[PDB]
From a paper:
Rad6 monoubiquitinates histone H2B at K123 in conjunction with the E3 ligase, Bre1, a modification that is important for transcriptional activation and elongation as well as mRNA splicing. Rad6 also plays a role in DNA repair, monoubiquitinating PCNA in a reaction catalyzed by the Rad18 E3 ligase. Yeast Rad6 promiscuously polyubiquitinates all four histones in nucleosomes in the absence of an E3 ligase and human RAD6B can form free polyubiquitin chains.
The Rad6 catalytic residue, C88, was substituted with lysine and ubiquitin was conjugated to Rad6C88K with E1 enzyme, as previously described for UBCH5A. The resulting Rad6C88K ∼Ub conjugate contains the ubiquitin C-terminus linked to lysine at position 88 via an isopeptide linkage. The crystal structure of the isopeptide-linked conjugate, which we shall refer to as Rad6iso∼Ub, was determined at a resolution of 2.28 Å. In previous crystallographic and NMR studies of the E2s, UBCH5C and RAD6B, as well as the UEV, Mms2 (19), a hydrophobic patch containing ubiquitin residue I44 interacts with the so-called backside region of the E2 which, in Rad6, is centered on residue S25 (corresponding to S22 of UBCH5C). This region of yeast Rad6, however, does not mediate any contacts in the crystal. Instead, the network of ubiquitin-E2 interactions in crystals of Rad6iso∼Ub is mediated by a non-canonical backside region of Rad6 centered on residue L56 and a patch on ubiquitin centered on F4. Mutations D31A, N37A and L56A significantly decrease polyubiquitination of nucleosomes.
Author numbering:
A (entry chain B): -1 to 76
B (entry chain A): 2 to 150
Amino acid sequence: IQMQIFVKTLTGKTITLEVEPSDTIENVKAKIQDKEGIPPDQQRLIFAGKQLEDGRTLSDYNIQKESTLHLVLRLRGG
Amino acid sequence: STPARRRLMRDFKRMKEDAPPGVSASPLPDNVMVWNAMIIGPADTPYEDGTFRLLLEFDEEYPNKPPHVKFLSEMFHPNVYANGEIKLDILQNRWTPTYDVASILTSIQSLFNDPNPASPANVEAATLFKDHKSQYVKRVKETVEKSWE
């Protein structure tokens, strides 16, 4: 049970990920780290106005197939 | 015996007779390198009257290296990580041998008054602190109640 989603920053830069509805926000942030080199602590993910918190899943936020999540970077973020 | 053990007995003597308000700490009877501490949620902060327990761990490099410290109480604060550790520069990049137990605890306690949402260890918490003040306070208060129990 898998779907393509997109993750886009405020700059326009976009990546594509394959995920599952039951992956966690934490799992998703790790994939992003691997794919864009950004530590999960510096990532803020937004979808339909809600910011995504770890230990919740994609399906929880109703993130369905081909959805685009907005990634906001906070530097130094530490 | 060791410089660290010597410095630490000074810190203890300090905490035993002239400890800052709302904070306390003491080694274990049989191991001076490990201390229980407690900071009370200062007045007029959402943390008011919480009893937040911490653990201080030292080794022989003290006081040339800070101790390792973390809360044992459940916390919700923009500068405390999920694992209880604390993002405070004098415990990391900016330590100097002039700090002791007393001054560490009072630096930590002061975060209850003026958090630093600029350096977030807890991102959920930093975010609520800026964007949802009411939601932030409710989370803090939950933490207050748990600290008793």
